Structure formats: structure tokens, C-alpha cells
């Protein structure tokens, strides 16, 4: 490729020397049957739930899931086999080994075996990419609590005033980088967020109720 | 003053020519009895709930509440009567009228009558100032909803993929100015905010339970 | 209101003293029939195309369109008549006239006559608001042209090198304020933008082709 | 030099031990004949299209193209041979080898052989530098598509309103760093950009038509 | 002038119709004797401490102090009388009155009478300008106090941990505009600032001790 | 873990092979008795002040203090033993050694022995985290001194004007990064800061006087 | 227009009621003869140098120069007479007077009389606009001087070290707004700027020498 | 130290094993005689101009100059020998070798031999630090040239208008980082900068003329 491949992806390149045909075609069938929209760990669950497949195929299947995104980040208008040939040539140029017709044939044969089945996986990784493809996004947050006190011009007095200052901390991404953001509240606004969000939840319930022809994704 | 006084505050300066002693002292007593931490509209409610006071005093009482903050934003270490004299002189310098001993005496007499009672009101306006006295604060927010669609490289296909992209818009202040801030979500994170806020609410319940010697303010 | 009303909106308040019932109900009927999503000038066209209505109603109808947004920016969960009463009271407080039962009744009667018909107009102004309700938006742009020249270390030579440096200037809004933004190009990139935009246009053609149950807005 | 030379440039320093005179002078002749304004890959094409040159010269020729910019970024008012001597001394100071008269002579001889021919290449690299030498520049962009939906206060209704919100994403450089920039559109503005750009293209056609004495560069 | 003169400065232009020679020359003498570096209020004190001068001259003397800066912001290399003539012509162009030889002569005569004495005042206003002539400067600050509390994972426990978080707020100017700046502390750092500043104060004492030939300004 | 552990923390993992029970339980007892809120160096002092403990335990105790924060940064709602198991599994995945039941048992046994005692240490590290958990914080500052001079339009004169321009430099953190900030002063403002800070110090004295039930932390 | 016209431009609208034909055509001839690229004050000089024209025409001629830019900022592709008609209609809509055929005819007749001659003036105002049409531009600058002193750890020593720290202040515009920018120097760099600028000046001399067919503008 | 020492500074630590007393004391004498304010290359010149010193001492003398800054960046109030002991202990902690009394004694003996002579060098490095110790500073700049052309609405015309748009590019530092800054000019402003700078140069000449008791530094 024009990109450098560490063993996180080269592992498959090295391990592709034994895997056979029935197992790969059956896995393609299963993935076509697999509920589209699964995470890498979900694919690990699917693999571990196997009974017809050998344990050796697992060394790359989880990586194939990651390689799928690299395989499915590929441009659609570009020919699949031609792109495979180009990336194989570039990899051999900067790869760990010079490729003869034997390993080249095994690689490209398995590759076309894969892309022929990536409809579900193509859709899954398209879905995964898009949810982030905005200006900024979300990870997590907390809240804190204060009990600030009020000091008189007469320090000898008993201070007997109390407060509740909620705080909020959100975790959000821009340009593939993390940041912080802080803000101040009070009780009423808290209730108001809460009620508003609950009613939003009802709205999703209604939209879920409406469309039957579309199954809605729940990906993280 | 060094500050210019429009009729929002000069109205009292002009209207102070008739109000008598019993009404002002009784109002001071009531305010001392008034639950510390009331807003201007709450003071309007207290005034309208009156039965011993004349209607004429109302022309400034609501303004006295606003003048109280101007009266209670005053520096504590500075002598009350001396500060009154200085501000009266500066106002007469740039005010609507040159002050003789008559109006000056009425003004300063009523002033000392007021500051002698501003303990509750001093505390109230101190409280009001502080909650904002941070780097930034809060007014309001909304949410929206999208139903983005997914387009294939084969436009002739039925598009059958659906999404739910919540949006958030917060209203927050810096340097006495307003702004906006926008962000992206998904269902799980919504539930997570909701649960976290509910548990925060429980925390306030516990802290409320603990301290009996302090009555906690609920000011907006 | 809490907002001050100049004659851009007070004009209706002043002019509401003569308009009758048949004309207003017929205009409501027409607006219900009016293609939802029309601009103020489109409403002016609709008005000028009238034959059953008097010319006098025009003094506010165009303003009603603007007042509609102020009438339709109103919060939905708040009762229509109660909100009308509150805004009428606040306006009378700071308005040009104190309102008796006569003008108050005429105003509120016409108001409820209007809000009873604002479904199309509510939808229109919701639509108008939303397209802008993002982080930033668009007005206009240009391009320029340069013919920079290349100077040798030998100034006595004939300079015979030529260039074409397109420039771009976009007009965009943040926080209700305008700005500028500038950038550099070359021929290929120009062709590339052009082709990409044309293919986008085809995409809209396809989506337009798909959905028959939804009529898509073309508002500016 | 004062700059450190990795093998991307030191490779020539190491490989200069065999190349002969006829090949270098013929390559200088060819480059003088080479259409001024070629990229490194274009120079690679020119090299691979060779028939009189040995394959060994290629190890640095492509680097000479890159070294040319380092050789042609050099200040013009500074003497060529004196600058060569200074940079050779500094490199020997921090280089991979201490230079005797033999390698020093080979290096400086080849250097003066090169700079004697860099008129075309000097012009080319001047041209390459300048197009970027502004406040900010360009790489690429995309567009997206939305199909936002409109929700009533009556959720039980069929939502039948549709929209088309194009989006734009430009890739631009400041201070040798990349960024993003986002914006909102609608159909008309799209057509308007398109027509405006087409007419700009016509303008280049006219200017191309006018000047015959100047051949205009098309460099990327 | 090219600048517009309101009555803050036009007042002198209007009031210059009566003042005589002995008073102005004696005031020039006094100002030459006046301790260089006085503020406008200090000049007011000097004026009010007068016994030989008429009260009428005061209407502009305080403004002359302000006009002095406008008179001493003037460029030094430009001829004093020529600059006076130019500014008088421009003012008459956009002033409240067209100037004949009479008022023109009175104005310019008094002007040259003034600039002939502005050595002390020139130095004073130069001094005043410079202290601000940096990137940013100072007005004021405060501190606050917190008593944050520590909440356990076991809310039923008595919270018995205490803190002291000083805060700081500085007031500083850039581009003739004000801002804020906030920061966090603890006790040790407070002591450290305090000791460091005290030792700085000693340093000024030493430098004050050293130079006898220079009297150091204390201007605000 | 999901985080990589260098020998700053892996040292304990490697050294945990000999430490016994009485020493660890006695150290837990001591730490419970240790004044909550001690720094790593304070824990080193506590360790070196030992007489019942072996010297070998010291190899990790100081690291346990650092590991405590990593152990006490852990989420409270997550089960202690389950989190220990998860982190042990992940570490064994990317650790220096694959863990059998022997080292796993020793590790987890000691771990539960520790977390059973971390109340004081949990509170300490919570305290340590929080003081920084704001928008920005403090390290240090200096001051400088100038003796700027005043130059006349007559350079032949003796310059005899003197000044004192204090400067300030603060060291403050945002986003775990350092910066600078500079500002200008004069004598009065210096005195004013000094007096204000002294009076703040008195305020802490008063608050210290008030609450007896809470011991206030002095951590750096 | 869509823009509001104050008397800075409405003055011509009001004063156009007397001017005749010979004077306007002769002024058009003169302007065609006028050296293209003159400022408003240069046009004032040209007017005052008149002998065939009446003094009354001057009331707008200087404004015509300003109106020319408003007349020449007009879009070229739009028909001149049609644009005149549109702007006249809009002005009459929001102007000081409703226009009959008489004043409308006088206005439009004079307008077409003007635009028929604006070739020189069109070029002039195009030129004026462009020089600013970049990201930022220039007004002015200064320099200052320091004589900082060096303080020992032994304050009793004679300080005998001296420095020269030039400073620079530039005045530059972005988005039609002014700013500042500051920087630090030393003697050598000063000489270097000076020499570099002088050699640049020589470069302009050479380019001036080269092209005879083009007269270069010197506009401010 | 708390800082890590690479061989740029550890080289002296390793090479200090042979240097003798007479050479170091004579070099201290020479440096005391050396014109205070010399750069590292100036010290190299001084060293190479030696005749009494051995060549071996040169391996660190140039580094001593750099180590001097590290030796003279040291805090003045801290005891020299105590600081030496602390830094030696910390270095031995993280250094290349554990230090016995022999190398420790040689190191500390030479160290005290050095600091006893660093008055000139202390002053030099203080001077070096300060000139940069502002908000931002300077390296270099250029200028460019344009010959923009003016295009008519009638493209068939001969374009015969010419311009001269100087450009400026400055190189300046903030927070130890580099940047750019760009700006637009014209001929007059160029002359104006030039004249202003020349007159500034005269000002330095005058100040140089005035003070004889202070020798002014010229450091780069």
C-alpha cells in the first residue's frame, strides 16, 4: 500500500498460508447471516460460538474484521481486483516479503473470496464510520457537587447559608483529539434536562413504532 | 455618583418627597421577616400582599429592591453615611436637580433608615451576585432530531437504513455575552446522562437530609 | 411583551380597528390553500393577486406574515389564549396605549381567529427557522484571477512564464454575524469541484424520484 | 549544513562514488530540453524513458530532483561555489564521514556541473514554491446529504415534509498544518457556483487565447 | 481638525472670548513651577488654591489640561504655529463657527502663549502616555474563598475534610478593551507572592537611595 | 489493563514474590493511623521511620502509593475483585509474563488485602486529584524591575526622570500543558495586592477558628 | 435602493434640479482627459482649477466621485439603465420624496449621461477597491526605545551595562477593523531591513524601466 | 539533576578526568579579560587563538560555555556548593556512572573553580536570556512582488494597467514556536518605513554619544 502495515494487519498476511476453502465459505455464509452491525467483540463472540470451524482461522478473523474496514474503506468506483493487485504490489514493495505467484495467488484468491461476501460487512463499516463523521462527538461525562459558604463582613457571625452548585464535565472529540468543557447549573435546570430527555425517549418509541420496513441499528 | 442614573433609579430620587416614617419602618420589619433570598417579583408579591401600607410607596419599593443591589454592591469597608454623602454629592453634580438641605436631609435620612435594615437584603443580593461569579453560566437548551438516510453506489436500490442523531444546543454566558454550543449524541449516552442526573438528585436529597442548622437557598 | 414592539409590528396593533370577519376568514382559507413554504414577498404576491379582499387589509397582512413568525416562534406547550393574554398585558404595560375591553377583545378575537389557521404558516416558519439553525451558513461568493509573473536573477531577460491562480471568497454566518474566508486553487481542482457538484445534482434527482408521498421544499 | 541530512539526501552523498561525466552532461542537456515544470514523478518518467544512461545513475537522480530544491532554495546572491564549500564543510562536520580532498573534489565538481545546468530546474522549483506561498491553500473536499424530517406537536400525524441540505468540507493549510471547514447550502446556490465556475473556465480560455509569447504552467 | 470636537473641547473655543494676558502668563509661570506630573484633578487643586486668578479662567483651565494632551499629542517635528493654523482651518471648516481674523487672532495668540510654556506639561503628558504604551496593563483585582467538601461513596458518613481554595481575578487592558483572567492558588503560594513583593519593595528603596540627580515620578 | 505498564509500576508486579502477611497488615494499620493526606515523599518518610518492617518491602511501598492512585482512580461502582480480575487478565495479555494460578493468587490476594485498607488512601488521592480538577492552576511566579529613561527632543540635555515598572510572570496549566502570562504594575497596586492578601489570610484564620469538627487539609 | 441613502449621497438627489447640459458634458470630457486614478481630493483640485464651469455644480461633483464608486461598484453584467430604474424605484420607495416623471427623467437622463463617461472613473474605482481586497493591509507604524538596566545580586555595585531594544508597532486591518502588533529587534536586524528595502526599491526602478506600454499607478 | 543530561553535556562529565589546574585558572583569567557578551562561536575563536593551552581542554570548553548557561541559569539565592552537591547527587542517581569520592571531588573542585570566575560569564548569559524574555521576537523576513492585471468587461481590449504590490513576511516566536505573518503595502509606505528607520538609527547614534560610563552590548 501507500500505508505501512504493522503486525496488527500483517499478521493475516503471514498467517494466510494454511486456511482452507470450506471454512472460509462457511464463515462468509454465517456473516451474511450475522446480524449486520456487529462490533469486533461481537464478531469474536460469533467466532467463539463456532462448532464447524477450526481454531486456527481465529488468528486473522478478528483481524479480518479490522481488515474489513481497511478493505471496506476502499473506494467503491475502483475495481475490486485491480485495487487488490495495486495494494498487493505496493505492500510487496514495502512489505516483509517479496511475493511470488504462489503467495500472491493465495492472497488474491482469498481476497476475492472475501469481497464477494462483504455486503453485510460493507454496510456495517459504512455505518460505523458515519456516526462519527460530524464536527464533534461524545464519550462521557460526570457531575460534581459544591457546598460553598457565605462570609459576612462580620466574621464573628455563624454562617448559616447553604448552596448546591452542580457541575458538568463532557468528553468530546474534534479532529481526532479529546478535550473538556465545563458549565454551571442549579436544581430546576436539572429537572428540566431530565424531563426533556425522557420525552425525547418517548419520541424514539413513537418513531420505532411507525416504521416496520426498517430495522434500526443500535451500534456504539 | 460616577455612574449616570436614568429614571429606572432616578424615579425614587424624584418620588421620595412624600413617603412617611411608619410605613418605611414597618416595611423594614417585614423585610427582616421576609424569607431572605427573594427576587424582585417576589418582593412585588410581598408588596401587593400588603394591607397596612399605602399604594404610593410602591412606586419605589420595587426600585428600592433594585436600588438595594446598587446600595448593597457598595463596598463594606467604606462608611455607610460617608458613602451616602459622596454619592449624593456626585449625583447632585450630574443629577436632575441641585440638592438643598431639605431634599438632601430627606434622602440621607431615608437612606440610613434603609441601610439599618439591609441585613436580609444584603445577604440576598450577595447571594444573587455570587452564583454568576464564575467563568461561565447557564440559561437554556433544546434538542433536535434527524433521520439521515444512506445512499448506495446503486441509486436504484430501496434505501432501508435508519438512524437517530440527537442534537443539543446550550445557552451560556461569558463576559456578560451570550453564545452557542453544539454537540452530537446517541441513545445510550442519553440514558446515561439521565441516570447520572437522577443519582445526582439523590445526592442533593442526602445532603439536604444531613444539615439541619443551615437552610439552603433556592434562587434562580 | 418582554420585548419592545416598534411600528414594524405595532402597525398592526394600530390598524386592527376596522378589519372585518369575512375577509379574515377567507384569507385564512386561502392561506390553508396557499402552498406551504412561501416567503413574505410570495405572500405579497398572493395578496396582490386578490379579487375578493379589500385593499385596507394589506396594511398588516404582510406584517401578519412577519408577526406570524413572532406568533409561531411562540412555545407550543404554552396555551395559545393564555399566551395571548400575557403578551397583550405586557404590551399594554409598555405599549403605545392602555387597552380597554374593546380593543383587547378585538385583538384577542382576531388573534384566536389567526392561530386557528396557522397550521400551514406554523409549518412554514418552522421550516424557515431550521435551515439556519446550525453552526454556520451561506450567502454568496465570487472568484478572482491573477497573472503573477516570474522574475529572474537576471532582470534583463524576457519574462515568459505564466500562471493562473484562481481565488475564492465565501460569505458565511456565525452568531448572527458575517465574515470572510479565502483560499487558493488551480484548474484541475476547479474541474473536480464542478464534476462532483454535477453528480451531487444527479443524486438529488434520484432522491426526488424515489419518494412520492413527500413534497420537498424549495425555500431560500 | 546547519540542517541534518538523513539518507533521503545522504544517499547521494554516499552513492556519488561511481557516476561518470558523459552521463551527467547528457542528463543536464536532456533536463535543459525537459519541459520546465515537471514533478519528481515526471522526472522519474523521463529517467525511465532513457536509453543512453546507465541504471546506476537513477539511485540519486530522483533525489537530485529533491536535492535540486535544496540546491535551488539556496540564496541567489551567495556565490554558488562558496556556498557549496560552506555546506560541504558543515556536512563533513556533522556528516557520516570526514571528507578528504578526493571525495570533496568529486562532490564539488559534480555540484558545479549541476548548478551550471539548473536554469530550467531553478525555474521549476521557484514555480513550485510560489503557488503555496500565501496565507492558505487547498487539497480536497467532499459533499454530503441530509433528509431531515419535520416533527409536529401532534406526533400521531404522518410526517410528509422533505428537505435537501447539502454540506461541504474543504481541506486547507495554514502554517504547514491541516484543518477543516464546514458550511451549509441549497440547490440554487449549487447551480450558481456551477455556472460561475464554468464562466471562469471560459475566462481562462480567453486569456490562454490572448498571450502567445508566454507558455502557461500546469503544475499541481 | 480631521477629528470632531465636542463641547468637552469646544467649550474652550467658545469661552476664549474674555480671558486676559496677566492671568494666563501667571498661570504659565505657576505651571512651570507646578510639580511636573500632575493629574487633571491635581491641576484642579492647583487652580482652586489660587488667589490672584479670576474664577472665570477655570471654565477652560481644566479643559486646557485635557487640551494640553491633544495639544501635546501633536507631532514635534511639525511647526507649532503652522500646525495651529492647519487645525484652526480644519476646525473652522467643521466647527461651530466660521472664524474671522478677530477670533482667529485671539485663538492663535493664546495658543502660542500656551505652547511657549508647555515644557512641564509636555513632559507630564508624555509620561502619562508611555506607562500604558505596552501590550497590556492593569486596573484591579480581588480574591474569593471556597470551602469545597468531599463526598464519599458512602453518603451516610460524616464528611469531615476541609479545604481552602483562594481565587484571583485581575482586570487588564488590550487594544483599549477590558477583560478578565482567573487562576487557582493555595496558602504557600500566597505567602510566596507576599514575600517576593515585599523584597521587590526593598529593591525600589535601594534604587531610590542610589540616584539623587533624578526625581522619580509617582503617577497613577 | 488497556494501559501499558512500565517498570515504574511493573516493578511491584515483579517484586511481589516474597512479601509476607504480618508486614503488609501492619503497614495497613499504620496507614490507617497515618495522617490522611500525605504525599509520596511523606510516605517515604513514614516508611523510613519504620522499625518493625523489613527493608525489602520498600521496593514497592513507594510505588504502592503511586499504584494506589491507579488503584484509587478506579471506578467505585465497579466491583473491586472483578476489576482486579479484569485488569490482571489484560495485564497478563500484554504484560511481561503469562500468569498462572500461583502468581495470580498472590497478586489478587495482596490486592484485596490492600483495597480493604484504602479508606485513608482513597480519601487522600481523591483529595489530590480534585484541587487540580479545574480549568487552570498554578505553579510559580517572579517579578522583575525596569529603570526606563526619558529622551528629549533635545538630546543634549541631562535626562533626570526616573521610573519603576514592576513586572509579573505567572506559571499556569491548561490541558496538562504549561504557559506564561505577563502584566504591568506600579507601587500602589503592589501595596494593594499585599494588603488584600493579608486580609484574606485573616479570613482563613477566622474560618479555621469556626469549625472544630473538620480538620482542614494542607496538601501541595 | 436596498441601502439607505443619507445626505452624504442624497445631497445630489436634492441638488440635481438646476445643473445643465454643457457643464456636465464638458466635465465628462475633462474627466476622460483627467489622469485616471485620482482621489476625491484630486478631483476637488481639478474642480477648483476650473474656469468654464459654474460654482453650483461643485455641490455634487465631489459627491459624484463618491457616488461614482457606488455607481461603479454596480454589477457590470446588469443593464445600466435597468439598474438605474431599479435603484430609482427602491430609493423613491424609501427616499425623501416620491418621484414623478419630471425628477425621474432628470435623474435618469443625468445618470445615463454619467455612465456613458465612467470608463476612466470605472477603472479608477476598480483600482481603488482592489489594493485593499486581500486578507489584511496597512496604515502606519512607529518605533520606540528602551534603556533597560541590569541588576546584580550585589545591589551596592555600580550598574554599568547598557542596551538598545528597538520596538515596532504596526497598524493593520482585517474585516474592516483595526488592530495592533508588536515585536522586538536589535541593531543588525535594523540595518538588514533597511538594506533589503533599498534593494527592493531598486527592483521597482528596474521594472519601471522595462515596460513602456503600461503606465503604473501611484494611488494611496 | 531533575533533568536528563545527554552527551551534549555529559561529554564534560566524561572528559573531566585529565584537565589540570594551570590551564583552567589561566582560562578563567582570560575569560575575565574576555569581552563580556561573547557567543559560543566567539568563545571558540578565543580558544583557537590560544597558545598556552593544550588542545585537549577544548573538548569541553565550548560545552562549558553551554554548561555555563546551565550553570548560570542556576538560582542565585541558592548556595553554589550546595547546589553543586545536589545536582551531582541527582546526576549520579540518573547518570552514566555512580560517583565515588574521587570523581566527585574532581567534579566539585573544578566546579567551584569555575563559579569563582563566572562574573563575566554570568553577566553574558543573563544578557543572552533577557533579550528574548518578552512576549514575542524576531528572526527574519523577505518581500515579494506582484504585477496583477486588470480585466475589462470587454475581454477583447488591450489591458494596459499596471500595479506594484509589495508583500512582507516576518518570522517571529511565541512560546518557543515559530509562525508567519503577512501584510500588504505600497511605494509611499515603503519610503516611510525607510526614512523612519534611518532616523531611528540616528537616535541610537545620539544615545551612544551621550553615555560614556556604559559600554553597550551588541549581541545577536
Residue numbers in the entry:
A (entry chain D), B (entry chain C), C (entry chain A), D (entry chain B), E (entry chain E), F (entry chain F), ...: 1 to 220
In the authors' words:
As an example, MBK5214510 shows evidence for the presence of dimeric, tetrameric, hexameric, octameric and decameric species. In parallel to the crystallographic studies, we also determined the structure of MBK5214510 by cryo-EM and single particle analysis (**[Fig fig4]; [Fig figs6]; [Table tbls2]**). Within the 2D classes there were clear examples of top views of both octameric and decameric ring structures. Filtering of these two different classes allowed us to resolve the octameric and decameric structures at ∼4.2 Å and ∼4.8 Å resolution respectively (**[Fig fig4]; [Fig figs6]**). The octameric particles resembled the octameric ring we observed in the crystal structure, while the decameric particles were assembled in the same way as the octameric rings, but were composed of five identical homodimers rather than four. The octamer determined by cryo-EM is highly similar to the prediction but shows greater flexibility than in the crystal structure. (**B)** and **(C)** Cryo-EM structures of MBK5214510 octamers and decamers. These different oligomeric species are present in the same purified sample, indicating a degree of structural plasticity in the stoichiometry of the ring-shaped assemblies. In both cases a star shaped structure is observed with C-terminal COMM domains forming a central platform and the HN domains lying peripherally on each side. AlphaFold2 predictions were able to produce confident models of closed ring structures using either 8 or 10 monomers (predictions using more or fewer subunits produce either fragments of rings (e.g A0A558G9V7) or physically unreasonable structures) (**[Fig figs1]-[Fig figs3]**). The modelling, biophysical data (**[Fig fig3]; Fig. S4**) and cryo-EM data (**[Fig fig4]**) thus supports the idea that the bacterial COMMD-like proteins have a capacity to form closed ring structures with some plasticity as to the number of dimeric building blocks that are incorporated.
The ten eukaryotic COMMD proteins are core components of the Commander complex, with central roles in endosomal membrane trafficking and signalling. We find that while CCDC22, CCDC93, DENND10, VPS26C and VPS35L are restricted to the eukaryotic lineage, ancestral COMMD proteins are present in both Bacteria and Archaea. These prokaryotic COMMD-like proteins have very low sequence identity (<20%) to any eukaryotic COMMD family members but share a conserved and highly similar fold including both HN and COMM domains. Our biophysical studies, crystal and cryo-EM structures confirm COMMD-like proteins readily form homooligomeric rings composed of eight or ten subunits assembled from core dimeric building blocks and inter-dimer interactions that are analogous to the heterodecameric core structure of the eukaryotic Commander complex.
